């Protein structure tokens, strides 16, 4: 398909979709894991890769685009995908960190 940018309506079917139809969850993160998720998804839904964003450590790291609806949480830093279906509702990259917005 064409090339589109990543919105929220998208973000939120997006999150289903993975989930819903396979592994990411409980999937250990990492720099490369994350990039080749990117493409993976661009490739799969022409989404721009540059809507996957995370905040920073320590601890849980809360999804920067509103609507995605994975964190990364750690193990016992090592951290693992979890996927959260109220990051539909609550922002929270947002009030952590409205610096960024």
Do not use: N
């Amino acid at each position: 398909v064409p090339l589109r940018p990543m919105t929220y309506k998208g973000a939120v079917d997006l999150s289903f979709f993975l989930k819903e139809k396979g592994g990411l969850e409980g999937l250990v993160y990492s720099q490369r894991e994350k990039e080749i998720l990117d493409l993976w998804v661009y490739h799969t839904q022409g989404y721009f890769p540059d809507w996957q964003c995370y905040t920073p450590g320590p601890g849980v790291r809360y999804p920067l685009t509103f609507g995605w609806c994975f964190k990364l949480v750690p193990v016992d830093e090592v951290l693992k995908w979890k996927f959260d279906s109220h990051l539909a509702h609550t922002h929270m990259a947002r009030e952590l960190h409205p610096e960024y917005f």
